[PDB]
Structure formats: C-alpha cells, structure tokens
Design the sequence.
C-alpha cells in the first residue's frame, strides 16, 4: 500500500489532468519512459455526470463504474495500461468513492443519475446505499464530515457490505486492467475503518503487466489536513500513503519569501509533516491551483514554482507528484474541447512543449531535469548543507548530486558539492546533449569544491548537477 510499485530507476507520478487514454499511452512511450518518470495519475475513468459546459469538475460526480468517459472507453484504457506498463510507467486511478452526484443528470455512457431519488441504475445504487441526507458543515465534528453530503453530493455508506463489495469490484477490475494503485478522492470524508476493509479486499497487482509477484496496489489518500480540525491525516497512514497538503502550503510560502530558505535545513516531520514514507508530496494539485489561495505556487508564477518543484525533487522526503495542467482563466473552465464536447488532444510543438492549451509542466526542462536528478541520487541522504543564513541554500545528495537555490541576492560561493571532480551540466539551464552542456556547466575540483554562481536575476533560482549529466 505504501510502495508506488515504480519500475527500477524511475520516480514521480505526473497528473495528466484531463488527458485521454490514447494520448497518455503515446506520452508514456515518447516522453515519460525516456525521461525516467515513474507513473501517471489519470483523471477519473469511471462514468461521471455530463455537466453544462463540460467543466473539469464533472469528473468528480460519479454516475456508475462503467469505464467510458471523455478520456475513452475500456479498450482505449487497456491499450494505455498495456503500453504504459510496457514502457515502465505505472498508472494510478483517481478513485472517487465517497459520493455519486450532487444533481440529476445523465452520465458519459448514457446512464441515469437520479440525485433526487438517490437512484443510480447503472451500478445499481438506491437510497438504502447512502447516508441519510445532511450537510457537511462542521469540520470540528468528524461524523458530520464523514456521514453527511459534501456540497450536496449523495454520500455513499461504505459501512454497507453491498457498497463495500461494489467499490471493491470496481477497484479490482482496475487492478485486473493493469493499474498500479489509486489516488483516493475525499478520503477525509470517509471512515478509516471502512477504508481499511475496502483496501484489504483489493487483489495483488496483475503480473501480466510486469509487476513483481505479491505487489500490492499503491494507495495514496486525499486528506486535506492543515491542522485544527476533528480529523487528522494520521488516522489514514495505517493502510496507505496520505497526500501531504501542509507540504505545498509551507513550501509555497517559503519560496514566495514568506520564510527564509535557511529554515528548510530541517524540512520534514519537524515542520508538522507526515513521516516521509507515509507521504505523497506535490507543490500544487488540480484543486488548489484554482482555489488554494495565495500560498500555493502554480505555473502562473513560474520562477518560484520551478524552485519549489526542484526542492521537492532534490529532497529525499516522500513520493513526489507533478501537476500537468491545461491553461485556464476561470476556475470552472473545462479542458480544451471541440464543438461536440470532445476533448482536444495535446499536440507536441517543435520545441517539445505542448500545443492546444496544455501547460505540460512535466515537459519543462527544469522539471524533467529534476526527475533525472532524483533518479541519479537514489539512495542518498542530504549532505553538505549550506546556507548564507538567509535565502541562499545548497546541499548535496550523497556524492551523486548537488543543488543550490537563491531567493535573495546572487550566490557566488565555492561550495563542497561532495561530487567527483569533473564538468557537470546544470540540468535547470540546460542538459547534457551530444557530449556537451547546452546550458551552464560547473567544474568540480578534486576536493569536491566548486565555484557556484547563480544570479538572482536569472530565469531560474536553482542550479542542479548530478553524476548522470557529467561530461
Ligand atoms: Ca462520506
Ligand atoms: Cl490530490
């Protein structure tokens, strides 16, 4: 439950938000595999409500567990799991199991969603499968949070043997199709007791998709816990990982100057975070990039955003997830679509960025460069920590990688990188290409020391070098 089940030499999960199965399959082969990414978190693959204007949020109102959505059908889904797994890239399903719809309608596969009478024929679910209607309105009351309707969404009763069976069957069907695990939506709104039973009923991963024998599905739970509520993220760590929301708030604040970088010296549980092995971390997610408030860094504030991502990828704490967004100006805005409501696929430009309105943060050199960094430093700890007692910090990951940051002033120092002597290509400003560095290079001397210079006025506020990008 806490092992991502990544293939060897890979790291990070990319949230390919609103992507189609065919496109994800292509991406696994053409980019994710070559760049060393470990997995993809897909948008909900089960039938969901068709809402006016086709907003991104319609995916979070389940109508049934039929695999037929704007992302594709089941055959498209299996083509994706086959191809991604063959390319060593795992698939994680966004499991929306706390509720059904908040309104009447029809699903993406034509199924009826009777919110009013609490009837979802395609499952089927009837009124007896839901908690008696009430509104979630008191986060200081755990039972209110778990047993009532979150914003009018019919609340499933996972205490029911019937409901548990339906959910287990759905998730097991996904495992059969080659998925590696699940992002559990609105875990805070469900009881750990019910969740443990459900999770325990999941079968081992399908070895026909390349998984090791006895592999268990990776479980990472969305428990938005910023403290001071009746429910704690600690209640969920017993049976799977938990998405660490304090991580992004704290880093977002720090990299925006709300705190001095020197303070990150003891980054980890001391900052009130979960223990690393229990955490899945990220700078921003699909929800908080829209309504996270000012503390959250997103693609719209590029420089500090990339720094935060670089710190996340360079630091040994947790399993890392990278957001891949579609450009938006309105919080309700759905992904790029044609006149019939069909999704427009991301295209790849001649500079390797995405066309058609997709931001593709995962394709940013600074992001994939750092995924490469994380792979090169596997097994190391933070060493050679340095800081100017203000906003300049640097540290090595064993003797395999070195990273430096400045959120204040020019960094010009000779630092012990702990790396072997040689010329290294900074993977932020460029990369090792054709036996040369396309960007900045750093020369490390015999004693591991090197002259690090990173001006505060450069496009990026981070420099990163590792043994896999050495001349
Ligand atoms: Ca609930
Ligand atoms: Cl999330």
Sequence:
């Amino acid at each position: 439950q806490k092992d991502a089940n990544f293939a060897s030499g890979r790291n990070s999960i990319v949230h390919l938000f609103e992507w189609k199965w065919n496109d994800i399959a292509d991406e696994c082969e053409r980019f994710l595999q070559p760049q060393g990414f470990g997995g993809v978190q897909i948008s909900p693959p089960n039938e969901y409500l068709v809402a006016d204007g086709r907003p991104w949020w319609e995916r979070y109102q389940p109508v049934s567990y039929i695999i037929n959505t704007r992302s594709g059908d089941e055959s498209a889904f299996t083509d994706m799991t086959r191809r991604c797994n063959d390319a060593g890239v795992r698939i994680y399903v966004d499991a929306v199991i706390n509720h059904m719809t908040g309104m009447n309608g029809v699903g993406t596969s034509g199924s009826s969603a009777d919110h009013d009478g609490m009837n979802y024929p395609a499952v089927p679910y009837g009124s007896g499968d839901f908690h008696s209607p009430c509104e979630v309105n008191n986060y200081q009351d755990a039972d209110n949070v778990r047993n009532c309707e979150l914003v009018g969404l019919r609340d499933l009763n996972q205490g029911s043997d019937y409901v548990r069976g339906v959910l287990i069957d759905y998730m097991n069907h996904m495992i059969d199709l080659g998925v590696a695990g699940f992002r559990v939506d609105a875990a805070k709104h469900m009881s750990p007791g019910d969740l443990s039973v459900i999770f325990s009923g999941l079968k081992n991963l399908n070895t026909d998709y390349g998984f090791a024998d006895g592999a268990r599905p990776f479980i990472y739970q969305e428990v938005i816990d910023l403290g001071g509520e009746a429910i704690s993220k600690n209640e969920y760590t017993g049976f799977g990982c938990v998405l660490e929301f304090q991580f992004g708030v704290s880093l977002g604040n720090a990299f925006q100057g709300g705190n001095q970088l020197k303070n990150l010296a003891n980054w980890g549980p001391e900052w009130g975070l979960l223990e690393g092995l229990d955490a899945v971390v990220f700078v921003d997610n699909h929800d908080n990039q829209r309504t996270g408030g000012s503390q959250i860094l997103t693609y719209k504030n590029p420089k500090p955003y990339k720094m935060a991502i670089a710190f996340m990828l360079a630091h040994p704490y947790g399993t890392t997830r990278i957001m891949s967004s579609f450009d938006f100006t309105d919080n309700d805005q759905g992904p790029p679509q044609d006149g019939s409501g069909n999704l427009i696929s991301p295209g790849i430009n001649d500079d390797n960025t995405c066309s058609n309105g997709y931001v593709c943060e995962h394709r940013w050199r600074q992001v994939y460069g750092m995924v490469g960094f994380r792979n090169a430093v596997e097994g190391t700890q933070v060493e050679n920590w340095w800081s100017n007692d203000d906003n300049q910090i640097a540290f090595s990951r064993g003797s395999q990688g070195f990273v430096a940051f400045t959120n204040g002033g020019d960094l010009n120092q000779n630092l012990n990188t702990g790396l072997p002597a040689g010329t290294y290509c900074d993977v932020i400003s460029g990369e090792l290409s054709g036996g040369s560095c396309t960007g900045k290079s750093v020369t490390v001397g015999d004693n591991g020391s090197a002259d690090i210079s990173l001006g505060s006025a450069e496009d990026d506020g981070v420099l990163a070098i590792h043994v896999n990008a050495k001349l």
The first helix runs from residue 21 to 32. The pocket of calcium ion (ligand 1) is lined by residues 98, 146, 155, 189-190 (CB under 6 Å).
